[PDB]
């Protein structure tokens, strides 16, 4: 200390405070992200066929959950930066707009997609169909700064 916490409360400025630093960095992120998970959309869809009978990448979807879950909560984290009990219950509950209902939704939907396991084609389909379908909400979600889409 006195990093230890003025770090992750730095982590929670960052992400959280519009900038020319939050933009250039961060959205240089979402869309490599978006290609990569995407591309690995296409190949997933078909790796899910292979974990009928063989070795498969379809463990990197499982990397990816757990990179949105953890995304997901990282926000809840940035509600107030040492708030990790307060806001993190208190923005989740501020997070009324449509996108932000569906989040919700789909962060739920994604833990129980990997606790049913790796199969029910449903986890499958939702890995697709939940969540990559959020990440494409996330172009008009898009938080580079514009007061975008409207």
Not at 76 to 84: E, I, N
Not at 90 to 104: C, E, N, T, Y
């Amino acid at each position: 200390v006195l990093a230890r916490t003025h770090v992750q409360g730095r982590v929670y400025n960052f992400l959280e405070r519009p900038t020319g630093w939050k933009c250039f960095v961060y959205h240089f992120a979402v869309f490599l992200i978006v290609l990569v998970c995407l591309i690995f959309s296409v190949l997933s869809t078909i790796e899910q066929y292979a974990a009928l009978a063989t070795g498969t990448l379809f463990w990197m979807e499982i990397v990816l959950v757990v990179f949105f879950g953890t995304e997901y909560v990282v926000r809840l984290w940035s509600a107030g930066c040492r708030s990790k009990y307060v806001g993190l219950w208190g923005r989740l509950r501020f997070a009324r707009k449509p996108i932000s209902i569906i989040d919700l939704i789909v962060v739920v939907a994604s833990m129980v997609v990997l606790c049913v396991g790796s199969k029910g084609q449903v986890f499958a389909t939702s890995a697709i169909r939940g969540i990559r379908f959020l990440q494409i909400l996330r172009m008009l979600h898009v938080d580079r700064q514009g007061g975008t889409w409207r």
